[PDB]
Design a protein around this ligand. Sequence first.
Ligand SMILES: *[C@@H]1O[C@H](CO)[C@@H](O[C@@H]2O[C@H](CO)[C@@H](O[C@@H]3O[C@H](CO[C@H]4O[C@H](CO)[C@@H](O)[C@H](O)[C@@H]4O)[C@@H](O)[C@H](O[C@H]4O[C@H](CO[C@H]5O[C@H](CO)[C@@H](O)[C@H](O)[C@@H]5O)[C@@H](O)[C@H](O)[C@@H]4O)[C@@H]3O)[C@H](O)[C@H]2NC(C)=O)[C@H](O)[C@H]1NC(C)=O
Ligand SMILES: *[C@@H]1O[C@H](CO)[C@@H](O[C@@H]2O[C@H](CO)[C@@H](O[C@@H]3O[C@H](CO)[C@@H](O)[C@H](O[C@H]4O[C@H](CO)[C@@H](O)[C@H](O)[C@@H]4O)[C@@H]3O)[C@H](O)[C@H]2NC(C)=O)[C@H](O)[C@H]1NC(C)=O
Ligand SMILES: *[C@@H]1O[C@H](CO)[C@@H](O[C@@H]2O[C@H](CO)[C@@H](O[C@@H]3O[C@H](CO[C@H]4O[C@H](CO)[C@@H](O)[C@H](O)[C@@H]4O)[C@@H](O)[C@H](O)[C@@H]3O)[C@H](O)[C@H]2NC(C)=O)[C@H](O)[C@H]1NC(C)=O
Ligand SMILES: *[C@@H]1O[C@H](CO)[C@@H](O[C@@H]2O[C@H](CO)[C@@H](O[C@@H]3O[C@H](CO)[C@@H](O)[C@H](O)[C@@H]3O)[C@H](O)[C@H]2NC(C)=O)[C@H](O)[C@H]1NC(C)=O
Ligand SMILES: *[C@@H]1O[C@H](CO)[C@@H](O[C@@H]2O[C@H](CO)[C@@H](O[C@@H]3O[C@H](CO)[C@@H](O)[C@H](O)[C@@H]3O)[C@H](O)[C@H]2NC(C)=O)[C@H](O)[C@H]1NC(C)=O
Ligand SMILES: *[C@@H]1O[C@H](CO)[C@@H](O[C@@H]2O[C@H](CO)[C@@H](O[C@@H]3O[C@H](CO)[C@@H](O)[C@H](O)[C@@H]3O)[C@H](O)[C@H]2NC(C)=O)[C@H](O)[C@H]1NC(C)=O
Ligand SMILES: *[C@@H]1O[C@H](CO)[C@@H](O[C@@H]2O[C@H](CO)[C@@H](O[C@@H]3O[C@H](CO)[C@@H](O)[C@H](O)[C@@H]3O)[C@H](O)[C@H]2NC(C)=O)[C@H](O)[C@H]1NC(C)=O
Ligand SMILES: *[C@@H]1O[C@H](CO)[C@@H](O[C@@H]2O[C@H](CO)[C@@H](O)[C@H](O)[C@H]2NC(C)=O)[C@H](O)[C@H]1NC(C)=O
Ligand SMILES: *[C@@H]1O[C@H](CO)[C@@H](O[C@@H]2O[C@H](CO)[C@@H](O)[C@H](O)[C@H]2NC(C)=O)[C@H](O)[C@H]1NC(C)=O
Ligand SMILES: C[C@@H]1O[C@@H](Oc2ccc([N+](=O)[O-])cc2)[C@H](O)[C@H](O)[C@H]1O
Ligand SMILES: *[C@@H]1O[C@H](CO)[C@@H](O)[C@H](O)[C@H]1NC(C)=O
Ligand SMILES: *[C@@H]1O[C@H](CO)[C@@H](O)[C@H](O)[C@H]1NC(C)=O
Length: 630
Amino acid sequence: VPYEEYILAPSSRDLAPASVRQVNGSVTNAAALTGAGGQATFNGVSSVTYDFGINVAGIVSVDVASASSESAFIGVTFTESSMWISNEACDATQDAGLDTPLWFAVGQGAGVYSVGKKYTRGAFRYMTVVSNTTATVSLNSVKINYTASPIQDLRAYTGYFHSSDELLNRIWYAGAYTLQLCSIDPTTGDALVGLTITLPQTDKWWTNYTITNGSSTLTDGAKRDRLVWPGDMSIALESVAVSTEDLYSVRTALESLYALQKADGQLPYAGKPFYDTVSFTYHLHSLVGAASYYQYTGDRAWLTRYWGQYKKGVQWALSGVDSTGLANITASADWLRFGMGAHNIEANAILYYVLNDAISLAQSLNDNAPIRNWTATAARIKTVANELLWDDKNGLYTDNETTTLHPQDGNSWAVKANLTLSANQSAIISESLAARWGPYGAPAPEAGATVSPFIGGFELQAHYQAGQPDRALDLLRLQWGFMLDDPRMTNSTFIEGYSTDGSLVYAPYTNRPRVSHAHGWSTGPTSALTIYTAGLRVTGPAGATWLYKPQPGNLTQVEAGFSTRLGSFASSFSRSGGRYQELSFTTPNGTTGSVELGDVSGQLVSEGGVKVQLVGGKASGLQGGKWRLN
Ligand SMILES: *[C@@H]1O[C@H](CO)[C@@H](O[C@@H]2O[C@H](CO)[C@@H](O[C@@H]3O[C@H](CO[C@H]4O[C@H](CO)[C@@H](O)[C@H](O)[C@@H]4O)[C@@H](O)[C@H](O[C@H]4O[C@H](CO[C@H]5O[C@H](CO)[C@@H](O)[C@H](O)[C@@H]5O)[C@@H](O)[C@H](O)[C@@H]4O)[C@@H]3O)[C@H](O)[C@H]2NC(C)=O)[C@H](O)[C@H]1NC(C)=O
Ligand SMILES: *[C@@H]1O[C@H](CO)[C@@H](O[C@@H]2O[C@H](CO)[C@@H](O[C@@H]3O[C@H](CO)[C@@H](O)[C@H](O[C@H]4O[C@H](CO)[C@@H](O)[C@H](O)[C@@H]4O)[C@@H]3O)[C@H](O)[C@H]2NC(C)=O)[C@H](O)[C@H]1NC(C)=O
Ligand SMILES: *[C@@H]1O[C@H](CO)[C@@H](O[C@@H]2O[C@H](CO)[C@@H](O[C@@H]3O[C@H](CO[C@H]4O[C@H](CO)[C@@H](O)[C@H](O)[C@@H]4O)[C@@H](O)[C@H](O)[C@@H]3O)[C@H](O)[C@H]2NC(C)=O)[C@H](O)[C@H]1NC(C)=O
Ligand SMILES: *[C@@H]1O[C@H](CO)[C@@H](O[C@@H]2O[C@H](CO)[C@@H](O[C@@H]3O[C@H](CO)[C@@H](O)[C@H](O)[C@@H]3O)[C@H](O)[C@H]2NC(C)=O)[C@H](O)[C@H]1NC(C)=O
Ligand SMILES: *[C@@H]1O[C@H](CO)[C@@H](O[C@@H]2O[C@H](CO)[C@@H](O[C@@H]3O[C@H](CO)[C@@H](O)[C@H](O)[C@@H]3O)[C@H](O)[C@H]2NC(C)=O)[C@H](O)[C@H]1NC(C)=O
Ligand SMILES: *[C@@H]1O[C@H](CO)[C@@H](O[C@@H]2O[C@H](CO)[C@@H](O[C@@H]3O[C@H](CO)[C@@H](O)[C@H](O)[C@@H]3O)[C@H](O)[C@H]2NC(C)=O)[C@H](O)[C@H]1NC(C)=O
Ligand SMILES: *[C@@H]1O[C@H](CO)[C@@H](O[C@@H]2O[C@H](CO)[C@@H](O[C@@H]3O[C@H](CO)[C@@H](O)[C@H](O)[C@@H]3O)[C@H](O)[C@H]2NC(C)=O)[C@H](O)[C@H]1NC(C)=O
Ligand SMILES: *[C@@H]1O[C@H](CO)[C@@H](O[C@@H]2O[C@H](CO)[C@@H](O)[C@H](O)[C@H]2NC(C)=O)[C@H](O)[C@H]1NC(C)=O
Ligand SMILES: *[C@@H]1O[C@H](CO)[C@@H](O[C@@H]2O[C@H](CO)[C@@H](O)[C@H](O)[C@H]2NC(C)=O)[C@H](O)[C@H]1NC(C)=O
Ligand SMILES: C[C@@H]1O[C@@H](Oc2ccc([N+](=O)[O-])cc2)[C@H](O)[C@H](O)[C@H]1O
Ligand SMILES: *[C@@H]1O[C@H](CO)[C@@H](O)[C@H](O)[C@H]1NC(C)=O
Ligand SMILES: *[C@@H]1O[C@H](CO)[C@@H](O)[C@H](O)[C@H]1NC(C)=O
């Protein structure tokens, strides 16, 4: 396994805290609970906050060697961010109030106390052991069984990335570990058990809803929600594919979502047991997820199984396209952003992307009948979207035909999809989006004074696709170095969202501690750095066809790789002064692909010796194997 040192995931599922952060009261040998030899003696009312170093998850067990009064109690509290360390409560999961400590009456006697997976804590970095009674207790250990990525070898990555920019490397591996943390045992889902409260009052919590079929599944957030969400998949899937390659949790998630499709084709806002809600964009995201799951797995059986449902969902989306040629949205539910309605640039951009995905899929399946309608509809969406929604003055798309707001999501998606009329226009959008950056990242005005890493990943893809890799690297540094290195963060996983002023306030949530610090949809940098900076782009099922387009920017060394069922993809180059010194790549045998290197002239040689001339920095029909530039 390459670059194992960067993999954050624990080397054992039997975890003890790494270090002692704080001792309140009189506690002997607190470090005993960190693996150091000995026992920890809590003498009366006391507490100790321990730090795991990384975000972890699982079931706590308290090994009591001794207790005094039959009324002795040891509590355990958990939190992701250091902001919420308390001897009286955990961080929050519900729309209001903090969650209660797990209270183990150690007064009954010695032994190991635990409440099992019903009280799984999905994410926490700091753990507080609390002695709230005057009694003296002696504890041999307080440990956790790590229950994330439940059926995987945690450090057996199949993908890797390593650049000359160490901050980027750490961002990549933090995103991978975030995704590992969001993959859970499906029987421990739904942290929103409650679907007004002050610190004295604590909220009961439990994880005992089976959200999907199978033995593993990828949810939106480790601590919460622990439901399946289609929108997050639009980043989570590709970031999983190039790192752990645990597409099984993605598949169970997607299958659970499709099991809930309605007779009109409408796909769910979220998996069970969330309220039945109509969301144009999230139905579309279910379609995007199916398409990209086929793209990376190449599972023809699975695609055949679900093609009828996919076409029904496409038709449900197309039922909204009106006389204008654009979709007229009547469902405000989206990524928790406001103002979702009417002729949204984001909805129609996702729709264009979806229609092109569907055309590609139907050509792969030789289902030519729906192709003409889909192609014509997509072309009309493009035309009328640029006629009615393009603001040439401000260089952005507006949210709809009757507003002055230019959204980050809509413009990002309009660049990611080929909705722009020209490459020049994509460049204008990239520049205008970058001009809005604040001291803490890219803003999403459609959701108020919010910075959304979710939308930040799509902005990254836009910047890369406009010809601005270094703009995207600057956004990576500015935003994700904040999410990684801010002292309030976790330094291992990525946050769900925050505010433009640098506060961890997330506008839709009044309960600030319920903001989860481990969300898969914030892992855009992993797939972005692998696909765009390193240049390894799958363009066919499981990599049957591919495209090598490294966009190094001002990077001097870049090495990356991942795997599919066809074989191993690898990229490696070193530059200086705007010229490649070395460039090599590997693709699975039997595949054919193309290369776009830029203002690079010379010849590519195969392992056999086949020589191909770069014409405009390009090449075509290239067989699979180890190729090098001379
Ligand atoms: C600390 O936490 C860890 C979390 O990982 C616990 O370990 C896990 O325990 C579960 C218990 O079932 C194991 O699940 C089983 O996994 C089988 C495949 O295992 C794969 O991963 C291994 C990783 O090393 C690997 O070595 C192995 O070769 C293989 O690749 C899987 O075939 C089993 O299938 C059962 O479940 C299917 C899903 O439906 C069921 O879902 C729940 C599961 O909880 C169940 O309650 C429900 O009733 C459903 O039946 C089902 O379709 C099948 O018919 C079959 O019943 C099963 O999922 C998991 O592998 C363990 N992971 C690791 C890494 O060990 C660990 O136990 C815990 N500590 C303690 C002390 O308990
Ligand atoms: C996940 O965990 C939650 C708890 O955190 C759990 O919810 C609890 O479920 C139990 C059932 O397993 C509930 O207990 C029942 O509540 C009903 C309604 O109050 C009562 O009628 C039940 O009485 C039983 O016994 C009676 C005779 O004494 C019978 O007449 C009657 O028919 C019943 O057989 C029993 O008290 C409990 O109220 C809830 N609590 C909460 C807070 O939800 C949930 O079931 C778990 N989900 C799983 C495991 O899938
Ligand atoms: C065309 O696009 C325009 C630009 O997006 C749309 O106008 C937007 O409409 C929305 C919805 O009214 C406004 O959203 C704002 O939301 C905040 C917060 O409200 C939310 O949160 C509070 C709690 O804080 C909760 O109580 C609410 O129920 C919401 O869930 C409010 O403070 C604002 O007053 C407002 O409601 C946008 O501000 C608004 N933008 C602009 C520029 O007008 C327009 O709706 C679209 N066209 C159509 C036909 O829908
Ligand atoms: C240390 O913490 C434990 C765990 O919370 C405490 O045990 C708890 O004691 C309270 C006492 O009121 C119990 O609350 C409930 O009170 C109502 C009356 O308002 C009563 O009807 C309920 O039956 C219950 O007694 C709570 O259930 C109990 N928790 C457990 C798990 O037993 C303990 O008292 C604390 N010790 C000190 C010294 O603070
Ligand atoms: C081919 O694709 C087009 C989309 O470009 C589909 O046309 C659209 O179909 C929906 C219903 O599926 C129409 O919505 C309906 O509009 C009428 C008004 O005429 C309204 O009374 C209904 O209640 C409903 O809202 C939509 O207007 C229509 N748009 C256009 C431009 O035709 C068409 O269904 C697809 N055909 C096939 C065979 O897939
Ligand atoms: C993304 O969209 C751009 C346009 O916004 C596409 O480039 C355009 O491609 C069309 C054809 O797909 C060109 O229009 C026509 O091409 C035919 C040949 O097929 C020619 O006979 C006509 O005279 C006309 O030129 C158009 O010139 C071209 N424009 C530019 C600026 O490139 C691009 O292909 C799209 N990319 C993807 C991946 O979909
Ligand atoms: C936040 O995370 C970073 C890593 O992403 C932590 O910094 C890292 O700290 C380790 C030590 O725990 C450094 O490696 C060690 O170097 C020592 C020599 O001093 C050696 O004996 C060890 O075997 C190990 O190689 C690592 O270089 C360093 N990396 C960076 C980029 O700082 C940091 O401690 C974390 N901070 C918090 C508050 O969690
Ligand atoms: C140990 O006591 C300290 C107080 O010195 C606790 O820290 C406080 O935490 C609250 C949040 O619950 C903050 O609002 C306060 O600002 C903190 N105190 C100070 C002086 O800044 C800490 O939570 C306690 N830790 C344990 C494990 O009991
Ligand atoms: C887009 O959809 C909206 C509803 O989501 C339509 O709004 C209605 O338009 C009719 C026009 O005759 C008005 O009489 C109604 O009062 C409008 N609704 C409301 C709640 O006021 C709108 O017409 C649609 N536009 C297009 C072009 O299809
Ligand atoms: C649109 C979705 O919003 C969030 O889902 C939640 C739904 C309800 C509540 N709640 O009311 O507790 C909290 C979160 C979550 O970020 C998902 O990733 C995102 O796709
Ligand atoms: C998983 O599937 C079984 C039957 O195969 C079903 O009983 C169970 O409810 C399912 N769990 C879900 C859909 O979360
Ligand atoms: C590196 O940054 C400089 C700006 O200092 C820019 O001019 C140059 O184009 C960048 N290099 C590449 C390969 O884009």
